[PDB]
């Protein structure tokens, strides 16, 4: 009795909708494409969705391929167009979907379930607030399909939306009910519970840390459960808890015994545990014992599955990748200390005949290279040739993995004679780069890139064959590997530097890049790598690139102009104008950057008669850090190129860099900092006024923990130059910045930047000598960094530095505290 309610449609649209569904099930394809569009077009009503769900709930006298299809098209009508949703009509969807879930038919259960989940995750958890309490009340079990359906709905809801739940904070009452179903008889319910709870563990919410003590104790009881899903969610829970928590004695045996499970998915869910463990500092003194059982298991998984060989695409994270990664982080934890565990296996598999295993062996060699590098060197002189000859294999996977794994020992290959190792590697590598198989081209290129990156100037004599084969591949490649070809040539010019500047090498390399240059338009995204490629090439061709400087420079300035214009338009009126892709600015600037770094003063004629400085001053204020990074880099290159044109704009530049000194934008800060450096050595004494704005930030930056060494080096050079030109304003900070300055300035070459930096510090010390005394050790340390100093600089060190030593009794007790080689190098050199 009491009170009730319901909804009733009419015989109007039900017949037409039923004909549209019965014909929307037609075996023809044109009928599906027609009727499905007509139904996605008959949504202009507020009542239509109540028609569909009326077919789902009350139309109990109709075949299920029609009912479930109606509910599914309702799913798409809510998930798709939900802004024009009638609220009162959707109420019927809420009540009917909520109360008709325990239907005995599994199909209706599944479609209603996905209706509830899509209504929740697409309709948010706010507008409908009586859903979760009624689901949790319906969760107290009855028959079977009821609590299982509402439970699964809570699984997909808790899998999608999770943070938002942290309804009077209801999760406190959720966990015990899960625990009530945590010791359930049916395995599926439990597998739903574990996966339900596994979402709120990495988020380390405040509701679980109270009900966790017995939670995990109970979690261990599901160790011997048979349903692969239960093992999946449980092992998942342990892997996730390994990151935010520190029974380790038997869990290692359960996991290692479970790593060889019959299901590769579950074995993966248990395989991430080794990554999460090897990341934490606990793995050092807990994992070491039972390893000889672990290593072969990993190698047992590192072979390609029977499934994956046929799809060659592959997935993106498998037991293969997870095993290789686990072996990676473990090798990085142990360094040379894992040779015994593996070496017999390598000696075996590396010379097998069934290649499916040999591939695994070569991959394992690639997996321990970075980790166990120092202990692997002695075995190498025989290892590489077997890989060299392995490059001549006929099967593709072994050839490619030979390219990459062979590429991983680029240092030892290039740190030995060339005609012995580097020449044959380059030869065969180039011969397999021109392959009929795609992955061999891409992986062989991405191996050549590393080979040049570690080889550098050793590639000068062979540039004819290198460029010949690489441009043969240029005209012979496709598109997805062409990006990596641009990578290879860019890394080339970056590696072999100026020695590229020969007219016939230009005749090999430049005609195709000019063809690709001419055929492409400005709105084509493929210009992103090309310019970048040319950028590095513009660094190497130097003055030989003069005949083509005008058009390239012009096109870059134009691109910048257009992009900035569009930016302004989107800034003034979003609803009418378009927003641009600012990736066009950076790359352009990069080229311009590189252009200066290739031509120097030869760019003069171009920089004056082109309103480009103003464009830079407009770029340096944008929102994305990338354009400030690249724009400041260009500012440095232009400052060292020509300063007769930049001088006035300097007045409006230094304040910008005054606010662009921020470590949160590392990629920018360095460049910004570097700019000031190249400014000071050009501004001379004129650099005087702008000091108090940049200096007090720079010194605070140079004494920071967890700071990249490149930023401390460019900051060091900047402070040095600011001191060389403005010693009276920079000098008093010596007690405050002298420590990490020379502490970090030990890992540099000897040219001009370090020279002007040490001139600056020498003038600043001659002007304020009181600052460095208590830390003078460090200074002497830095003085041990010079191998070829100039005459005047040498005099600067030996004369005054001699003054400190001449004022002879205490410099022994104070001197014999740092190593002898530097001691007698300073004592004999200065």
């Amino acid at each position: 009795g009491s009170m009730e309610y319901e909804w009733k449609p009419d015989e109007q649209g039900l017949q037409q909708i039923l004909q549209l569904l019965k014909e929307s099930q037609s075996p023809d394809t044109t009928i599906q494409r027609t009727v499905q569009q007509k139904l996605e077009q008959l949504n202009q009503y507020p009542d239509f969705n109540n028609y569909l769900i009326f077919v789902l709930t009350k139309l109990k006298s109709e075949d299920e391929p029609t009912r479930s299809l109606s509910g599914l098209i309702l799913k798409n009508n809510v998930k798709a167009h939900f802004q024009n949703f009638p609220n009162g009509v959707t109420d019927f969807i809420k009540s009917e979907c909520l109360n008709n879930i325990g239907d005995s038919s599994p199909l209706i259960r599944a479609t209603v379930g996905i209706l509830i989940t899509t209504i929740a995750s697409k309709g948010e958890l706010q507008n409908w607030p009586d859903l979760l309490p009624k689901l949790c009340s319906l969760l107290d079990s009855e028959d079977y399909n009821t609590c299982e359906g509402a439970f699964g709905a809570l699984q997909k809801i808790c899998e999608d939306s999770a943070e938002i739940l942290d309804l009077d904070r209801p999760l406190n009452i959720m966990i015990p009910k899960f625990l009530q179903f945590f010791k359930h008889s049916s395995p599926k319910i439990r597998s739903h519970a574990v996966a339900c709870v596994n979402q709120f563990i990495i988020s380390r919410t405040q509701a679980l840390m109270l009900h966790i003590d017995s939670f995990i104790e109970n979690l261990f009881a599901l160790a011997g459960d048979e349903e692969p899903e239960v093992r999946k969610n449980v092992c998942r829970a342990l892997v996730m808890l390994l990151e935010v928590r520190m029974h380790m004695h038997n869990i290692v045996e359960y996991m290692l015994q479970r790593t060889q499970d019959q299901d590769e998915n579950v074995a993966l869910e248990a395989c991430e545990f080794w990554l999460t463990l090897a990341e934490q500092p606990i793995c050092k003194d807990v994992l070491v014992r039972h390893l000889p059982k672990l290593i072969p298991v990993l190698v047992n998984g590192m072979k390609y599955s029977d499934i994956d060989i046929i799809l060659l695409t592959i997935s993106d994270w498998n037991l293969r990748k997870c095993s290789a990664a686990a072996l990676d982080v473990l090798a990085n934890v142990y360094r040379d200390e894992l040779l015994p565990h593996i070496l017999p296996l390598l000696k075996e598999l590396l010379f097998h005949h069934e290649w499916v295993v040999k591939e695994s062996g070569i991959l394992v060699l690639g997996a321990i290279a970075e980790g166990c590098m120092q202990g692997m060197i002695p075995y190498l002189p025989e290892l590489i040739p077997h890989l060299i000859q392995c490059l001549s294999d006929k099967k593709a996977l072994v050839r490619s993995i030979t390219c990459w794994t062979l590429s991983r020992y680029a240092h030892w290959v290039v740190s030995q004679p060339p005609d012995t190792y580097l020449k044959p590697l380059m030869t065969e590598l180039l011969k397999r780069i021109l392959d009929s198989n795609k992955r061999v081209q891409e992986a062989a290129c991405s191996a050549f890139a590393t080979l040049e990156e570690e080889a550098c100037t050793e590639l000068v004599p062979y540039l004819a064959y290198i460029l010949d084969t690489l441009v043969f591949a240029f005209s012979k490649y496709q598109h997805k590997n062409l990006l990596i070809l641009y990578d290879a040539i860019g890394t080339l010019a970056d590696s072999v530097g100026h020695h590229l500047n020969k007219p016939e090498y230009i005749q090999m390399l430049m005609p195709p890049l000019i063809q690709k240059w001419n055929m492409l338009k400005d709105e084509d995204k493929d210009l992103f790598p090309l310019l970048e490629c040319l950028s590095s090439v513009a660094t190497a061709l130097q003055s030989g690139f003069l005949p083509y400087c005008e058009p390239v420079y012009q096109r870059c300035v134009n691109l910048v102009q257009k992009t900035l214009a569009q930016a302004m338009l989107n800034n003034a009126q979003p609803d009418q104008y378009e927003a641009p892709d600012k990736d066009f600015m950076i790359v352009a600037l990069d080229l311009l950057s590189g252009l200066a770094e290739g031509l120097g003063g030869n760019i003069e004629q171009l920089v004056a008669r082109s309103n480009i400085l103003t464009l830079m001053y407009q770029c340096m204020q944008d929102k994305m850090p990338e354009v400030r990074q690249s724009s400041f880099a260009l500012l440095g290159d232009l400052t060292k190129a020509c300063f007769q044109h930049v001088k006035p704009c300097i007045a409006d530049f230094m304040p910008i860099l005054g606010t662009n000194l921020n470590p949160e934008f590392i990629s920018v800060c360095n460049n910004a900092t570097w700019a000031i450096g190249e400014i000071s050595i050009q501004m001379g004494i004129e650099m005087q006024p702008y000091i108090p704005m940049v200096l007090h930030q720079l010194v605070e930056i140079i004494n920071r923990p967890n700071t990249p060494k490149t930023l401390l080096e460019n900051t060091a050079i900047t402070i040095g130059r600011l001191g060389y030109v403005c010693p009276q304003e920079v000098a008093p900070m010596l007690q405050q910045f002298i420590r990490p300055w020379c502490t970090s300035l030990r890992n540099i070459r000897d040219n001009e930047e370090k020279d002007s930096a040490f001139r600056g510090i020498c003038t600043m010390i001659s002007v304020n000598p009181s600052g460095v005394i208590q830390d003078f050790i460090f200074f002497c340390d830095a003085v041990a960094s010079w191998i070829n100093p100039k005459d005047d600089l040498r005099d600067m060190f030996c004369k005054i530095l001699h003054g400190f030593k001449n004022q002879d009794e205490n410099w022994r007790r104070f001197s014999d505290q740092f190593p002898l080689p530097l001691k007698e190098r300073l004592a004999a050199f200065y």
């Binding site: 072996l327 990676d328 990459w404 992986a443 990596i484 990074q629 460049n671």
Partner: peptide
């Protein structure tokens, strides 16, 4: 010089499984 997303990009997109 420049903490280049160029050099870091072309370094990252070098293909490998390990």
């Amino acid at each position: 010089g420049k903490m280049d997303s160029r050099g870091e990009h072309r370094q990252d997109r070098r293909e490998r499984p390990y």
